[PDB]
Design a protein around this ligand. Structure first.
Ligand SMILES: Cc1cc2nc3c(=O)[nH]c(=O)nc-3n(C[C@H](O)[C@H](O)[C@H](O)COP(=O)(O)O)c2cc1C
Ligand SMILES: Cc1cc2nc3c(=O)[nH]c(=O)nc-3n(C[C@H](O)[C@H](O)[C@H](O)COP(=O)(O)O)c2cc1C
Lengths: 323, 828, 323
């Protein structure tokens, strides 16, 4: 009945003179006496008392503090990791030829970007097919621009709000269909919508679950709220002026049983899908949108009561276009 | 009144009566029809009187295999029917019914008369006597003997002639006693010693097999030679101290030897007039026929009359050993040579020249019709002297021959006789007519191709598409501009060591891209190259460099070891000319080098690339070893198109070959038939490839079923059959294969490609008639210059023909088919 | 210049009686005799001659065989891992509530799919807002469908091919703009285009790099070939019938210097923005497209001569629609 913890796949163990080193931190005291056997034992999945009997046989007080820290430090974890943890080890494989200034000097960044936007592939042979510039794209794509300011006084009309959400609804044509593709046809992304007070017509403030099958918003949480301090400051104005915000959540049970690990990857692709679809509809509806790369997801998954199999992957802010 | 033994010929007539033997079942039968003014009742009475005088006419043949003169017979009456009241058309209907019936009807054994005589009165003084007899009964000499006495009695019924005192039964007694010793034994020894190497009968250009004939159907080609021509031929024979029989046999022999492409030929010759036996034998009725075989040899350069004299001596000696029958000889011969009961001697010569009397039957009345059929004969050349007229008749089975060939052969016979009459010798037979035109157009292949040189083709293509990849092996490859820079440095290196025009460089056949660079450098500098396979037994690798007198061997590991990179990579001064040797290839280990010039090599390449529209989008799979002439096309043929060449690391791995075509998109296959066949057995039923557009199968035999596997796995590829010689510029003969196009046992060898010709020659280097098998020769612009360091072989293989120019004897055997192509029968 | 190998971060190990277990394989010999010191050295990046200097002290052949096997087994690796290796360890965290039969039995799978398409979030309250279906979507989105059947006789016209590719070209409006949103404005994904013989007008068969600034294609490789065995059986019909294909390649050097591991993640998302944008244009142009879940990318990466920092993240097959 105890929770099962696993040696995190993202943590690499090593020994030093100070103590046990896991990832970025050094542990000292009794933990050093737990050896490689702790490392091996933990890989199968253990309960806290099973583990303690195997490695303590001394005061449980010290053993409990050690084990508690390892859990708090994400050495011993309960389940699937979010993408920020999943890709972390890759930084140890990448070699950076550029200075750190890209992140500090806006000029260093502008220079960097200009080199990148003019890059070519090294293996290119000395030939060339010049393509025609004679065509045109539909306006829905070519006139679309990111929106960083919104109408703060006019509530989003109900019809507009509903029409935008409808872009992801289910259709039945002798089977269930969507307006976008999914790997394996499973559609494993749950959508949650957050609405601020008096900003969306017909909608009370709160966190709602969107069900494409019902074409409706089910209230999840009308107690808590999203605050500006849950965001990186660079995005605090987008957050402050938006009317609503949408979160995309990956449901592992809706993918992993069919594809295994590949399913998580495919979902990460699907997140680009959907977003682009929604953006096109927003253009037809005169609605502005701006995506966000990172925010405090731990507080949000707590608010939404997400389960062990649910991972937040992405979020988008928006409101009516302002003129 | 007792039965007697048969002569060996009569025994043979009896054996030939058996349907189980080839073209047999017909005891020889003869039909006659004559026109007279003389009354039948009197001729009929004269007929019974001749039976009384000539009791052999009263003979019966028994099923026993023996002959007996009947004690007596029911008296025979010539049946006479009057057609006098009938119009000529109806009279003819009756005459035609009796003639047809007498020709097809056969006398049963055990039938008492062995003759049948029926006559018609067409007008009160016009009579036609139709009659037939079985050959076992009598000779032709005997037929006229009878006619003379019969007409005697017509006119003088009471001028009683004496009976034969010496009779056939006495004749046969002596026969059985003679065949015990003396001359029999002497003749037997003569023939016994000759038999082991007696020649075969000549093989004619038959349209059909004897099995397809069954009952023969005879037709004839006839002519009468006038008395003046006959006397001129006799005088020629007199001047040359020979008999006309040798003169005629020799002319006949020329026709047969020409058409059959033979040097020696056995001729069935019929012997006449028996053995002396007694004082009255030429005065009795019986069969005096005996067989002799004539051993003729026409492999001469010598004058016509010389051949006649040789023939005469042969005839004269053979006839002194007549005491052993040719029937016995042939029995011994066919057992000796295991010929079995086959129609072994179907070509026969018969002569009554100075071997006939006044023709008692024509004294009775004119001959209107005559016909005879014998078993196992294809053509009977019979010549008769008739009161100075020379009668020539070729009796032949129409079912066995193409009528045009048959008319042509006869025509030639007569023309040769006319030349002997006017000049005294003849022109060798030759054929043209409705044949010459086919060969004349078959070889009409000239095309305007400049040839130039092999490296020039590369240089210009390299300038057109310099960044194209030319040579691919693994993940390593070279471009056209790279090949020129690298080969320019190597050529300067070679030039700088004293290697120039006229010299030779040996090169090793390794699978490296640098191999191509070294190969091109040798040619650009003007030297010929000689390829060596590194896996040849070492002593052979050394043999070739020494035997070919090469100056240096180029291994592949040279660029980095000879400091080639220190040399300039700019343009080279041109050296080679189209007439220079491009390469010498050693073949047929002992091996001889074959010298090939740039012009010959280029014309083959230019024609293949143009005919198959080879271009820069093509991919050639380099399966074939560099030790073959075949690889020249792949290397130079690719480079002149701007196409890509792929090297194969190990040609035996059929799975690798499959992996390569699938992974590289290969469009042109170029192998000997064995590789495609093996590769296809590593291919499952689910396999399909649509990258090959062209398959060249070159050399060796192509199985008729092979295209089936190629077509199902490569449904879009064009399969081509290519033949030729290495002593020629790789390919000479072309034929596409459009499925198995016919019920046949062979794939047409084909027709010449461009600026090349082909001939089929007889034993004396003259053109063979279409359908006749002879030696195969090639001519035209594709020829090699001879063998390197072997003069005797060059002398016999490369010859200058007085009509066709230089030609190469491949020594393969074959024939032209009237359809417009060459069919070959392998080497032998 | 000697290649440096790293212990692959995706591998974990244990001691056993049989030997040492690394990932799924059991090894014996020197590798066992080596202990954690081998592990710790491999962990920091070591070249072969250095590993032999430190860990041989036995027959050279024995030492060499062990290192060769570990490289072949991807225990020791050169650099950044592809997505299939990156997400692999998550398999040990997911627990499948369904039987394995959903991956073998068509019926078991159909059950799984139908059940998942009707799933909802468990933590919901008993109240909702129903949205209207009264509005509309444009045909360019609602009518799009994946195609698995193509017109193999009609070549793609040159102008059509150019107009489809123009959907991703650069525009200059006092800065470089694209027709779609991406990254932090870095656009770190390269586009490679593969054409089969005579299936595209004016283009020779081969692999080309697309340069969005020039609106041109430059040949990289016209020697090798893509074959049906580079595809799983389920997609071999698609392979056989397609005319051309597009590969999306992520340049770590274009993103990692600013975002670290997150850059890989964001690129995974961006690929789906690009994909959706492209499909919209393809529908106006009557070009069928289909995403591929898996392909022999290692062979393709080899063909394109991609460098150590480059990885293929996504590929799309297509041609003129069968009609
Ligand atoms: C990342 C991804 C990979 C996919 N891989 C494949 C595949 O390998 N084979 C295939 O036939 N379909 C594949 N599809 C599934 C279909 O493309 C698509 O989801 C299905 O047709 C339903 O959507 P639609 O009605 O818009 O076509 C893939 C889709 C995505 C988003
Ligand atoms: C995955 C992702 C995350 C992003 N996160 C942020 C963010 O946190 N803050 C922000 O203002 N813009 C963010 N952007 C950048 C903008 O969304 C936009 O793509 C960029 O400014 C290009 O602008 P454009 O409309 O002129 O093409 C993000 C984009 C992507 C694709």
């Amino acid at each position: 009945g105890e929770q099962i913890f696993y040696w995190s796949p993202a943590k690499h163990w090593r020994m030093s003179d100070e103590g046990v080193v896991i990832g970025e931190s050094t542990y000292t005291g009794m933990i050093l006496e737990w050896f490689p056997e702790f490392y091996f034992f933990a890989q199968t999945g253990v309960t806290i008392n099973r583990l303690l009997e195997r490695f303590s046989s001394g005061s449980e007080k010290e053993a409990n503090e050690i084990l508690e820290l390892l859990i708090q430090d994400r050495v011993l974890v309960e389940g699937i990791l979010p993408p920020r943890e999943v890709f972390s080890p890759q930084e140890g494989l990448f070699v950076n030829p550029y200075s750190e200034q890209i992140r500090y000097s806006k000029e260093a960044l502008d220079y960097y970007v200009s080199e990148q936007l003019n890059r070519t592939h090294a293996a290119c042979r000395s030939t060339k097919i010049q393509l025609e510039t004679s065509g045109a794209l539909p306006d829905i794509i070519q006139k679309r621009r990111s929106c960083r300011r919104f109408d703060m006084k006019t509530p989003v009309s109900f019809a507009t709000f509903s029409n935008l959400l409808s872009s992801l609804k289910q259709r039945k044509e002798d089977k269930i269909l969507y307006n976008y593709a999914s790997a394996g046809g499973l559609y494993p992304i749950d959508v949650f919508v957050y609405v601020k007070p008096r900003r969306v017509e017909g909608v009370k403030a709160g966190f709602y679950y969107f069900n494409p099958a019902d074409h409706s918003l089910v209230l999840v949480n009308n107690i808590d709220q999203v605050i500006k301090d849950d965001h990186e400051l660079i995005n605090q104005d987008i957050f402050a002026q938006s009317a609503f915000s949408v979160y995309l959540v990956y449901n592992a049970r809706a993918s992993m049983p069919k594809y295994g690990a590949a399913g998580y990857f495919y979902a990460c692709i699907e997140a680009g899908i959907i977003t682009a679809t929604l953006n096109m509809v927003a253009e037809d509806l005169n609605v502005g949108l701006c995506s966000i790369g990172h925010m405090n997801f731990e507080e949000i998954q707590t608010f939404l009561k997400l389960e062990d199999h649910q991972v937040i992957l992405h979020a988008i802010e928006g409101g009516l276009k302002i003129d | 009144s007792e039965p007697f033994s048969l002569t060996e010929v009569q025994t043979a007539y009896m054996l030939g009566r058996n349907p189980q033997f080839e073209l047999s079942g017909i005891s020889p039968q003869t039909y006659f029809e004559y026109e007279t003014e003389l009354d039948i009742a009197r001729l009929s009475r004269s007929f019974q009187k001749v039976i009384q005088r000539h009791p052999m006419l009263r003979a019966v043949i028994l099923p026993e295999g023996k002959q007996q003169i009947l004690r007596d017979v029911p008296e025979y009456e010539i049946e006479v029917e009057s057609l006098v009241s009938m119009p000529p058309e109806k009279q003819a209907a009756r005459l035609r019914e009796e003639r047809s019936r007498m020709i097809d009807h056969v006398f049963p054994l055990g039938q008492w008369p062995l003759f049948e005589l029926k006559a018609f009165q067409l007008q009160e003084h016009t009579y036609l006597l139709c009659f037939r007899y079985d050959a076992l009964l009598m000779d032709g000499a005997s037929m006229n003997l009878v006619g003379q006495d019969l007409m005697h009695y017509y006119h003088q019924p009471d001028a009683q002639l004496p009976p034969l005192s010496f009779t056939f039964q006495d004749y046969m007694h002596i026969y059985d006693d003679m065949k015990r010793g003396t001359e029999y034994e002497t003749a037997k020894a003569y023939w016994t010693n000759k038999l082991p190497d007696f020649p075969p009968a000549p093989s004619l250009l038959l349209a059909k097999d004897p099995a397809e004939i069954g009952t023969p159907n005879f037709q004839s080609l006839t002519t009468i030679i006038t008395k003046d021509k006959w006397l001129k031929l006799r005088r020629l024979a007199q001047d040359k101290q020979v008999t006309p029989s040798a003169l005629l046999c020799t002319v006949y022999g020329e026709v047969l030897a020409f058409w059959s492409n033979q040097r020696r030929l056995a001729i069935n010759l019929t012997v006449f007039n028996r053995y002396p036996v007694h004082d009255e034998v030429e005065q009795i009725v019986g069969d005096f026929t005996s067989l002799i075989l004539l051993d003729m040899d026409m492999d001469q350069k010598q004058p016509f009359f010389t051949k006649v004299e040789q023939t005469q001596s042969t005839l004269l000696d053979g006839l002194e050993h007549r005491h052993y029958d040719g029937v016995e000889f042939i029995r011994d011969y066919t057992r000796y040579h295991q010929m079995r009961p086959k129609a072994v001697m179907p070509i026969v010569f018969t002569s009554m020249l100075a071997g006939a009397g006044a023709f008692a039957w024509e004294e009775i009345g004119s001959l209107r019709h005559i016909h005879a059929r014998t078993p196992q004969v294809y053509l009977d050349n019979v010549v008769i002297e008739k009161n100075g007229e020379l009668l020539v008749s070729w009796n032949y089975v129409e079912e066995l021959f193409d009528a045009e060939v048959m008319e042509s052969m006869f025509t030639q016979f007569v023309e040769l006789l006319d030349q002997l009459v006017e000049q005294g010798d003849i022109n060798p037979l030759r054929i043209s007519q409705k044949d010459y035109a086919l060969i004349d157009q078959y070889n009409a292949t000239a095309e305007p191709i400049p040839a130039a040189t092999l490296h020039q083709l590369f240089i210009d293509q390299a300038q057109r598409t310099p960044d194209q990849v030319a040579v691919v092996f693994e993940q390593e490859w070279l471009t056209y501009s790279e090949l020129d820079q690298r080969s320019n440095q190597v050529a300067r290196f070679l030039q700088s060591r004293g290697i120039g025009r006229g010299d030779r460089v040996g090169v090793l056949a390794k699978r490296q891209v640098e191999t191509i660079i070294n190969l091109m450098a040798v040619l650009k500098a003007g030297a010929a190259y000689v390829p060596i396979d590194p896996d040849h037994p070492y002593e052979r690798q050394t043999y070739i460099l020494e035997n070919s007198s090469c100056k240096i061997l180029l291994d592949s590991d040279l660029y980095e070891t000879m400091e080639i990179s220190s040399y300039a990579d700019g343009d080279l001064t041109p050296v080679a000319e189209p007439e220079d040797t491009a390469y010498v290839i050693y073949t047929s280990g002992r091996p001889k080098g074959v010298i090939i010039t740039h012009q010959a090599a280029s014309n083959t390449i230019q024609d293949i690339n143009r005919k198959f529209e080879v271009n820069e989008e093509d991919r050639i799979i380099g399966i074939s070893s560099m030790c073959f002439d075949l690889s020249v096309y792949d290397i130079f043929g690719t480079l002149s198109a701007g196409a890509t060449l792929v090297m194969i690391r190990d040609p035996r791995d059929m799975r690798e070959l499959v992996r390569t075509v699938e992974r590289r998109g290969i469009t042109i296959w170029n192998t000997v038939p064995a590789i495609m066949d093996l590769a296809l057995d590593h291919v499952g039923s689910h396999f399909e490839n649509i990258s090959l557009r062209l398959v060249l199968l070159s050399g060796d035999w192509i199985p008729l079923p092979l295209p089936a596997k190629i077509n199902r796995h490569f449904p879009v590829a064009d399969v081509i059959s290519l033949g030729g010689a290495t002593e020629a510029s790789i390919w000479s003969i072309y034929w596409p294969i459009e499925q198995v196009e016919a019920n046949w046992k062979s794939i047409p060898y084909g027709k010449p490609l461009a600026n090349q010709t082909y001939y089929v020659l007889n034993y004396d280097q003259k053109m063979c008639p279409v359908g006749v098998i002879g030696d195969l020769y090639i001519g035209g612009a594709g020829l090699a210059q001879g063998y390197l360091n072997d003069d005797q072989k060059t002398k016999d293989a490369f010859i200058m023909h007085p009509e066709f120019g230089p030609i190469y004897k491949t020594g393969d055997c074959g024939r032209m088919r009237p359809e417009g192509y060459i069919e070959f029968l392998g080497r032998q």
